[PDB]
Amino acid sequence: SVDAFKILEDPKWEFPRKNLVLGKTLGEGEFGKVVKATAFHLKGRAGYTTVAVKMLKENASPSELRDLLSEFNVLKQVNHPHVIKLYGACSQDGPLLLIVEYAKYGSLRGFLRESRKVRALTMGDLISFAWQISQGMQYLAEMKLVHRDLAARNILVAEGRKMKISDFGLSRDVYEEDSYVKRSQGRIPVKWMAIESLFDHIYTTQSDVWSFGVLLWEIVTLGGNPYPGIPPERLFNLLKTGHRMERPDNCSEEMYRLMLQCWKQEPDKRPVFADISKDLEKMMVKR
Numbered sequence: 001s002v003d004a005f006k007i008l009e010d011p012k013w014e015f016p017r018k019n020l021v022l023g024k025t026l027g028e029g030e031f032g033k034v035v036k037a038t039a040f041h042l043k044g045r046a047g048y049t050t051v052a053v054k055m056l057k058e059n060a061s062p063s064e065l066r067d068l069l070s071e072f073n074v075l076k077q078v079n080h081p082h083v084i085k086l087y088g089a090c091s092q093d094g095p096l097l098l099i100v101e102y103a104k105y106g107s108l109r110g111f112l113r114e115s116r117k118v119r120a121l122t123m124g125d126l127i128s129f130a131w132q133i134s135q136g137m138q139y140l141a142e143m144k145l146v147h148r149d150l151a152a153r154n155i156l157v158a159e160g161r162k163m164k165i166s167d168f169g170l171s172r173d174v175y176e177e178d179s180y181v182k183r184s185q186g187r188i189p190v191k192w193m194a195i196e197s198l199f200d201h202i203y204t205t206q207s208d209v210w211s212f213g214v215l216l217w218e219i220v221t222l223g224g225n226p227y228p229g230i231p232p233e234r235l236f237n238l239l240k241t242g243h244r245m246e247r248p249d250n251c252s253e254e255m256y257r258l259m260l261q262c263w264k265q266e267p268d269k270r271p272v273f274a275d276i277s278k279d280l281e282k283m284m285v286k287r
């Protein structure tokens with residue numbers, strides 16, 4: 001009935017728009033506009049706190065609001081150190097604003113791309129990043145939740161070079177809830193899509209392991225674009241015929257072995273994030 005525009009008000013998460021000073025735009029993707037801000041008297045006590053506010057673009061489409069609200073409810077449920085922390089919101093009688101943790105160093109891909117022309121990033125730094133994101137995904141899988149997109153773009157980096165999983169707009173439950181859900185078709189970048197997602201549109205938690213395998217590639221390549229040059233059809237055939245991405249330039253032999261474990265044909269035989277987090281710690285403790 002009620003048009004999707006009208007949003008419900010959650011009492012715990014509603015923050016006064018009067019107690020918020022917006023500022024410099026941090027980015028404006030298809031997800032929406034995110035600006036830097038600081039909020040006074042946030043979560044009880046007592047001073048101001050520098051945050052980041054996502055919002056609708058000036059030319060927002062209904063699906064953008066539908067996904068921004070689908071991003072809201074997922075952020076409400078989850079609370080984890082390596083998952084960007086939702087601090088508040090501004091829904092009623094005004095533009096919808098999501099007050100979220102401020103991860104200064106920016107998108108992980110932007111963090112990796114900036115460093116290779118310039119800060120110095122050791123190899124031990126990269127395995128720590130994947131180990132951080134493995135724990136965060138481990139937490140989300142313990143919530144029995146699929147994140148779907150998972151890429152070096154959607155991962156954030158906070159103060160002290162700490163990872164924060166973000167962009168929960170496309171998330172879905174591994175076991176469905178709504179009796180009638182409108183499925184958001186073909187929104188995931190084909191290169192990060194698991195073979196089954198390409199084949200049968202199935203986005204499981206083991207599919208996010210496939211996504212994590214591509215993410216590992218992005219990290220070690222420092223922002224590299226996966227499967228270069230290949231069009232969409234040629235990629236589907238490549239994965240169907242059996243080929244994957246080859247061992248990247250200056251990547252560990254046991255690290256590349258893990259990447260192929262995530263691109264296994266059968267999702268049933270794919271390592272789980274809890275058993276992946278142990279594989280990444282074993283890599284650092286040697287060094």
Ligand SMILES: CC(=O)N1CCN([C@H]2C[C@H](n3cc(-c4ccc(Cl)c(N)c4)c4c(N)ncnc43)C2)CC1
Nearest residue numbers: 026027028029034052054100101102103107166167
């Ligand atoms: C086109 C494209 O591929 N781009 C790459 C990603 N860019 C994002 C803006 C920047 N960003 C975002 C957030 C943020 C805050 C709340 C939420 Cl709910 C979400 N999802 C994210 C954020 C932050 N808390 N602190 C610092 N920077 C931040 C990364 C946009 C452009």
Ligand SMILES: [Cl-]
Nearest residue numbers: 029031034167
């Ligand atoms: Cl974003």
